[PDB]
Design a binder for this molecule. Structure first.
Ligand SMILES: CC(C)CCC[C@@H](C)[C@H]1CC[C@H]2[C@H]3CC=C4C[C@@H](O)CC[C@]4(C)[C@H]3CC[C@]12C
Ligand SMILES: CC(C)CCC[C@@H](C)[C@H]1CC[C@H]2[C@H]3CC=C4C[C@@H](O)CC[C@]4(C)[C@H]3CC[C@]12C
Ligand SMILES: CCCCCCCC/C=C/CCCCCCCC(=O)OC[C@@H](O)CO
Ligand SMILES: CCCCCCCC/C=C\CCCCCCCC(=O)OC[C@@H](O)CO
Ligand SMILES: CCCCCCCC/C=C\CCCCCCCC(=O)O
Ligand SMILES: Cc1ccc(OC[C@@H](O)[C@H](C)NC(C)C)c2c1CCC2
Length: 439
């Protein structure tokens, strides 16, 4: 039996040390990844590497030998490192949560206000103040119980069980774990409530149309560029480049920069907007509508044009009478729905509900924020049960088996391995692991 547990614990160390050295490396080697956010991810990663190299392995021998075969000085140091890694890991997570907040309520949506050099200072501090609070109590012995079982364990060098007093237990938990946890969950629930709130026409058309900086063919077969900017219906590729160079104002050779796709895009959206106000059949509907349904209208006119969207004679009349569901059935009865299936579905849903729900997590910068959520969410699942139990042991010390304590603690330990897997959501990371691994 015990041989079976050794493999598990051995396998587990390897994954933490493989997985995280890989994350640290990626970020260290590929400029594309050197960002404020991924600098904190490095801070997390290291926490886990120290967890995997210096904590988990000795925890593992502790169990199987049923004793502490490593001496007093280490035991003390081993426990202070253990605390350090969890303390630093929640505070980093919390600090990411606050960074993404200030980033998303700025007009530089999605970018950190922090510069790189400031990113490093925060991290140093988070580690120093984590370090002092994690090492001092343990070394200065402020953590020590005064009952017979505990004073006996402190003397025995083969004994290294985590006996502490309750003023240490409750204080440290709160300042080290509950405080930053509660702020993380609270602040980062607001980051989602903002991603959704600040969805607008531009991001919606960005999700629906995508982005291509070369010349390509839409489903009709016509020549398009940018965020769905149409150039010419004629099947002549030079006619495409003819209109492009015209539309930009330079020699282009069938290729354009992002600071030109965006300024074409903003003329196409203004074009669509002026079309709705110019056209008699559309204008009166558009004024009845709220901001979110108005976006759904502009989307349509982007795709078909004023003429075409005016043709939906029934659907428009209903929309104006706020009869959302009926009119959503008409728009399903359309050449439009048939040709482009998904785009239609998402647009109609917006008319239907008056909410951005169909574009939940569709934008790339929002998928980036979901991934960040999971890293947080998973910490909370993996460590919280243990930290509640550590606190329900202080109110009635006769209530939870040491076998339960060790299990729940090791769920903590096993959380260090999950962050790297979760990063294989990001393409930026998925490619970085690949070059590194030599796949
Ligand atoms: C294992 C125990 C005893 C000691 C480990 C703590 C120290 C040495 C480690 C853990 C995390 C580390 C790093 C985390 C990320 C940044 C990013 C980089 O661009 C500057 C270095 C910097 C700021 C590091 C500073 C040193 C650091 C704080
Ligand atoms: C007691 C045991 C577990 C020791 C563990 C120490 C390891 C994990 C620490 C000590 C110093 C650390 C860091 C030193 C400088 C930074 C610069 C940064 O931009 C990339 C990561 C990098 C290079 C870190 C990698 C992890 C690191 C090497
Ligand atoms: C449990 C199953 C999961 C897998 C466990 C496998 C075994 C453990 C590996 C040891 C850690 C160190 C290995 C990580 C080093 C990778 C990076 C490096 O080799 O990349 C070089 C680069 O400069 C080129 O582009
Ligand atoms: C990859 C992460 C780290 C891996 C590192 C693994 C090192 C150990 C090697 C195998 C067993 C050694 C041989 C066993 C020799 C004596 C066994 C003894 O009888 O064990 C008593 C005890 O376990 C009763 O409770
Ligand atoms: C990181 C790895 C740390 C190496 C420390 C190994 C354990 C120290 C025990 C020393 C002793 O037995 O007195
Ligand atoms: C601030 C803090 C940080 C981490 C904590 O537990 C980590 C857990 O691996 C413990 C150390 N392992 C024992 C079995 C030794 C705890 C605190 C407060 C007390 C419990």
């Amino acid at each position: 039996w015990v041989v079976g547990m050794g493999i598990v614990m051995s396998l587990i160390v390897l994954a933490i040390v493989f997985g995280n050295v890989l994350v640290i490396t990626a970020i260290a080697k590929f400029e594309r990844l050197q960002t404020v956010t991924n600098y904190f991810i490095t801070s997390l990663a290291c926490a886990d590497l120290v967890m995997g190299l210096a904590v988990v392995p000795f925890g593992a021998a502790h169990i199987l030998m049923k004793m502490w075969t490593f001496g007093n000085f280490w035991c003390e140091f081993w426990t202070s490192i253990d605390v350090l890694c969890v303390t630093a890991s929640i505070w980093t997570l919390c600090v990411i949560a606050v960074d993404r907040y200030f980033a998303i309520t700025s007009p530089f949506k999605y970018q950190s206000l922090l510069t790189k050099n400031k990113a490093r200072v925060i991290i140093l501090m988070v580690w120093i103040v984590s370090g002092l609070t994690s090492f001092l109590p343990i070394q200065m012995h402020w953590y020590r119980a005064t009952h017979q079982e505990a004073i006996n364990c402190y003397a025995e060098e083969t004994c290294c069980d985590f006996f502490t007093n309750q003023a240490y237990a409750i204080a440290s938990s709160i300042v080290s774990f509950y405080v930053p946890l509660v702020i993380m969950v609270f602040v980062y629930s607001r980051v989602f409530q903002e991603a959704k709130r600040q969805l607008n026409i531009f991001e919606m058309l960005r999700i629906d149309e995508g982005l291509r900086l070369k010349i390509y063919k839409d489903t009709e077969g016509y020549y398009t560029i940018g965020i769905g900017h149409l150039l010419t219906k004629s099947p002549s590729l030079n006619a495409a480049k003819s209109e492009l160079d015209k539309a930009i104002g330079r020699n282009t050779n069938g290729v354009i920069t992002k600071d030109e796709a965006e300024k074409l895009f903003n003329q196409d959206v203004d074009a669509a907007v002026r079309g709705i106000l110019r056209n008699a059949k559309l204008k009166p509907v558009y004024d009845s509508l709220d901001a979110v349904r108005r976006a759904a209208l502009i989307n349509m006119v982007f795709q078909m044009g004023e003429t075409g969207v005016a043709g939906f004679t029934n659907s428009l009349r209903m929309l104006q009478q706020k009869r959302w569901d009926e009119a959503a059935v008409n728009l399903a009865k359309s050449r439009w729905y048939n040709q482009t299936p998904n785009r239609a579905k998402r647009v109609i849903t917006t008319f239907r509900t008056g909410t951005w729900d169909a574009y939940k997590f569709c934008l790339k910068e929002h998928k980036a924020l979901k991934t960040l959520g999971i890293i947080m969410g998973t910490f909370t699942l993996c460590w919280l049960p243990f930290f509640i139990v550590n606190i329900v042991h202080v109110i009635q010390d006769n209530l939870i088996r040491k076998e339960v304590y060790i299990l729940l603690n090791w769920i903590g330990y096993v959380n260090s391995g999950f962050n790297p897997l979760i990063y294989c959501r990001s393409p930026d990371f998925r490619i970085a692991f690949q070059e590194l691994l030599c796949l």
